[PDB]
Amino acid sequence: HMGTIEISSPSKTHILAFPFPEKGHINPMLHLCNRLASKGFRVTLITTISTYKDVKNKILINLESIPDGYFNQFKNSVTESVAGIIEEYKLGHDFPPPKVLIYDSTMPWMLDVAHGHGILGASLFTQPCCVSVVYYHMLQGTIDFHREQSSSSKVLLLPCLPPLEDRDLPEFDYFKEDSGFVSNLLLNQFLNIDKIDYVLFNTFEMLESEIANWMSNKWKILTIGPTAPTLFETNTEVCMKWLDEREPNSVIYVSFGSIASLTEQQMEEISQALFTTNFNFLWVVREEERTKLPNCLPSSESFTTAAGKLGLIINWCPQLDVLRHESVACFMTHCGWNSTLEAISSGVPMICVPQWVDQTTNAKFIQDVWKIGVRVNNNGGLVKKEEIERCIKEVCESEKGKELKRNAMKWKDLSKEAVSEGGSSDTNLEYFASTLLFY
Ligand SMILES: C[C@]12CC[C@H](O)C[C@H]1CC[C@@H]1[C@@H]2CC[C@]2(C)[C@@H](c3ccc(=O)oc3)C[C@H]3O[C@]132
Numbered sequence: 001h002m003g004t005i006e007i008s009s010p011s012k013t014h015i016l017a018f019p020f021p022e023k024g025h026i027n028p029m030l031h032l033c034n035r036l037a038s039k040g041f042r043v044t045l046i047t048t049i050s051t052y053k054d055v056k057n058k059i060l061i062n063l064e065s066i067p068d069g070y071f072n073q074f075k076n077s078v079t080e081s082v083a084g085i086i087e088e089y090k091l092g093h094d095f096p097p098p099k100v101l102i103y104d105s106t107m108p109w110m111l112d113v114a115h116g117h118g119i120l121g122a123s124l125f126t127q128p129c130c131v132s133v134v135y136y137h138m139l140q141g142t143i144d145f146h147r148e149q150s151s152s153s154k155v156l157l158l159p160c161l162p163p164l165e166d167r168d169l170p171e172f173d174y175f176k177e178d179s180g181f182v183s184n185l186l187l188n189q190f191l192n193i194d195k196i197d198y199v200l201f202n203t204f205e206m207l208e209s210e211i212a213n214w215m216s217n218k219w220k221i222l223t224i225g226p227t228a229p230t231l232f233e234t235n236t237e238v239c240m241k242w243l244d245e246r247e248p249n250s251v252i253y254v255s256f257g258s259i260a261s262l263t264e265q266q267m268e269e270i271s272q273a274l275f276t277t278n279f280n281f282l283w284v285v286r287e288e289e290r291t292k293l294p295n296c297l298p299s300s301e302s303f304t305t306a307a308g309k310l311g312l313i314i315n316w317c318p319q320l321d322v323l324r325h326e327s328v329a330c331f332m333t334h335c336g337w338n339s340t341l342e343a344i345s346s347g348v349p350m351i352c353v354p355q356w357v358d359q360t361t362n363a364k365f366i367q368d369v370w371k372i373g374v375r376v377n378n379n380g381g382l383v384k385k386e387e388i389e390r391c392i393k394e395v396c397e398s399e400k401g402k403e404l405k406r407n408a409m410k411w412k413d414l415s416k417e418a419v420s421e422g423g424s425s426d427t428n429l430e431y432f433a434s435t436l437l438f439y
């Protein structure tokens, strides 16, 4: 016998990944890249020059930099730079040519860049299935989503979703004159959905069974989350030492994510609740937000509270390590999807303080569907300290809070099952990996 065998393996398959330059898009892409590199794939991650440093410190993965109302031009710039990176890799020798580009779902034009260069495109959605179908329905323009909520109250019924009140819909009016643009960006994720080679969602099937099945019947979506493990952030040693020295189940973790900015009055209400509650607290107040703290209050600051507890204000923390720490009682969150799913994967019940876009819908599901949190009552009204304290008491000091915690521990076990061998998310990711190898 005489002939040649050709082997298609992860080690000689080159995966390109390109997140939108924002931490709630960068981070789940990174986690996915680590998982794919673990399977042996060659993974090159592309990111803008102004996020290269953060991505560089947080992480084996090859890293490439490109350059950065400025969105309309952002599309034009990264279309060109990523296309060039694809062609240069098509001609090199120290790497396999790219087989697939994993791109952020909010950049659907990258599908044309991939297909126009002869490679496959995988769209990574960074928000849950449930709010994403809301975007799809807004795009279809059949049902009327306009809200002059001063005139009456509406409740919207969509297939395979619970009834949504007005305050449960994605929040766009916060952006005022920019609401149309932000709206457009989320809706346009679905413009070319029938042409995407792989539709990836950072969620797990048991979490969103009804709507995921609905989507699975229209499109061939792959639920592959949580992508985070069951990434080196700044202040890791400082935060872990402080938490290590606290009592079990005693710390309220507070963070509003990477971009939300609260008013000075809102900061004062949160501050007065945290300084008077019967719990320790770790509160992330980003450097550029520190000036909105009450004047009566710099990498970090330590406090003894009016209730005799301890507080730490810090400009950033390793959130996943924080959420998995035994000292943490609950998570006061803006309900960004990464924060929500990270808390689910850690068993931490939540106090929901949503600010805009998908955070309002996420809080609806957190409180009423998954039943692992309580949502505060004001979408732009001030949340007063008395209301915050009410939610702390319900979550951390009530029999209802014990049930919320039991619920979160149940969902934590299911998220671990989903990404373990035989789990739905492990199967879907291996479907991605295996079929990329196909002849
Ligand atoms: C997150 C996102 C909406 C959700 C979805 O994934 C798409 C995201 C796109 C980028 C995001 C956008 C809305 C918030 C922004 C940070 C906004 C901004 C910039 C500077 C500032 O000072 O204030 C606000 C303008 C735009 O850069 C934003």
Ligand SMILES: O=c1ccn([C@@H]2O[C@H](COP(=O)(O)OP(=O)(O)O)[C@@H](O)[C@H]2O)c(=O)[nH]1
Pocket: 022, 023, 024, 025, 027, 028, 233, 255, 256, 257, 258, 259, 260, 284, 315, 316, 317, 318, 319, 320, 335, 336, 337, 338, 339, 340, 342
């Ligand atoms: O002190 C912090 C605060 C946030 N995060 C991370 O930053 C992401 C926040 O994204 P999310 O979807 O929750 O909200 P966004 O910032 O996009 O509004 C998550 O991966 C968090 O783990 C963090 O590592 N440290």
